[PDB]
Write a protein that binds this ligand. Structure first.
Ligand SMILES: C[S@@+](CC[C@H](N)C(=O)[O-])C[C@H]1O[C@@H](n2cnc3c(N)ncnc32)[C@H](O)[C@@H]1O
Ligand SMILES: C[S@@+](CC[C@H](N)C(=O)[O-])C[C@H]1O[C@@H](n2cnc3c(N)ncnc32)[C@H](O)[C@@H]1O
Ligand SMILES: [Ca+2]
Ligand SMILES: [Ca+2]
Lengths: 227, 228
């Protein structure tokens, strides 16, 4: 299941270092999400823990999330932000968000969320149209449609502050990045594999950011804006 | 075997794609020097080096500490990331191996940041703690040394690191031996420290003075953010 050499080792991390400290609201949201047919899309508990610590470490206040689903990474983020922190959250699908929103409200951090229903790209274009929004975001978590990540990247580098951080999710893509082409793959795995392979090379060659691709979850590539 | 990941191929992909094209020349130099040394397996992997370097920048650290230096790959990764006036108090029982790597660090132009101390780290920590001026003065500590002392180091370091500061304990997944039965075949040094590591990991997860995150980078690194 995980990217690690054994399920035992992965389960050890969860049991030893993740679940004992998982906030109750996130446990709640996870268990709700696990019953939903699209539950494979949710952010893993270990990755949620990482994002939550990352938010604290970088002192982020104003963030953005592209790809919300039922809200596990969104809640992990909201809980880590200061009481007056904000998240601009985007998903084409509103109803899955609203499935998770009750947990977030109960957690007392729903006031931080500005949820927008619809495709992310036009929202980004509108933001960029106003210079006011340039360099205003501390952090962006991108966990949506892979064939648009290069396009998001172009826009987000205008919207994120110098020294700010963008996380691209699923950049190791089930480990399919090292399967031969003729290996058996699910259709959607094969389709997006092409884009992930290009994305990872484009980020490596992009001197506007410093990068770090981590084997957390399904891979996450941290991009720190330096130009 | 190369990594904690499900395949050497996947691990090699991370290095080839995302690490080595970005590795500073000075670190490549130190790595190639270190690779020739008999104890080279003790060195910090290039992917972990990259992660530590980004981490230092992200948390805005200036004053740090490293316990367990060897030839200095993690030390250099850190020194490169720190501001020009940043400092590292670096400790190792072995000076000769440090001095093997010091010329790369000097050439990289960040050797002035390093205060190297030869000897066991614990009495240095005790000496620091004896002077209140040192309390809560460190931004970051990387602990990559003797496992039977990690919990001892932890209590000392929580006095020396600022609220909101960060301690990273290295090798906390310990070759994955943490999920092997006592029965299983393992190298002697692995078996020797394995129960220290199992206890450590439980103790850190139970310690409300810190928030933790145990990452499958390198041989495992547990990040501990001081919150009390
Ligand atoms: C992997 S899920 C997000 C997971 C989420 N971060 C979590 O923790 O549960 C991907 C999401 O991106 C959304 N999505 C796909 N294309 C999008 C687009 N162009 N704009 C906004 N959202 C999109 C999908 O509706 C889906 O909910
Ligand atoms: C895994 S190596 C450190 C690797 C180093 N961070 C690097 O990137 O190459 C462990 C080091 O800890 C040192 N060491 C072991 N016990 C120590 C102690 N009690 N005090 C200080 N150093 C110690 C050893 O001499 C050895 O160099
Ligand atoms: Ca994801
Ligand atoms: Ca180590």
């Amino acid at each position: 299941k995980s990217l690690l050499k054994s399920d035992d080792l992965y389960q050890y991390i969860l049991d030893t270092s993740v679940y004992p400290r998982e906030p109750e609201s996130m446990k709640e949201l996870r268990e709700i999400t696990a019953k939903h047919p699209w539950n494979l899309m949710t952010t893993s508990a270990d990755e949620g823990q990482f994002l939550n610590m990352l938010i604290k470490l970088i002192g982020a206040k104003k963030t953005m999330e592209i790809g919300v689903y039922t809200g596990y990474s969104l809640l992990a983020t909201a809980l880590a932000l200061p009481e007056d922190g904000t998240i601009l959250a985007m998903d084409i699908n509103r109803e899955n968000y609203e499935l998770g929103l009750p947990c977030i409200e109960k957690a007392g951090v729903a006031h931080k969320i500005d949820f927008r229903e619809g495709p992310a790209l036009p929202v980004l274009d509108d933001l960029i149209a106003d210079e006011k929004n340039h360099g205003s975001f501390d952090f962006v978590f991108v966990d949506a449609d892979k064939d648009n990540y290069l396009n998001y990247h172009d826009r987000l580098l205008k919207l994120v502050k110098l020294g700010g951080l963008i996380g691209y999710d699923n950049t190791l893509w089930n480990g399919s990045v090292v399967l031969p082409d003729d290996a058996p793959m699910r259709k959607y795995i094969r389709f997006y594999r092409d884009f992930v392979l290009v994305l990872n090379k484009a980020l490596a060659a992009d001197e506007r950011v410093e990068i770090c691709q981590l084997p957390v979850g399904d891979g996450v590539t941290l991009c720190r804006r330096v130009k």
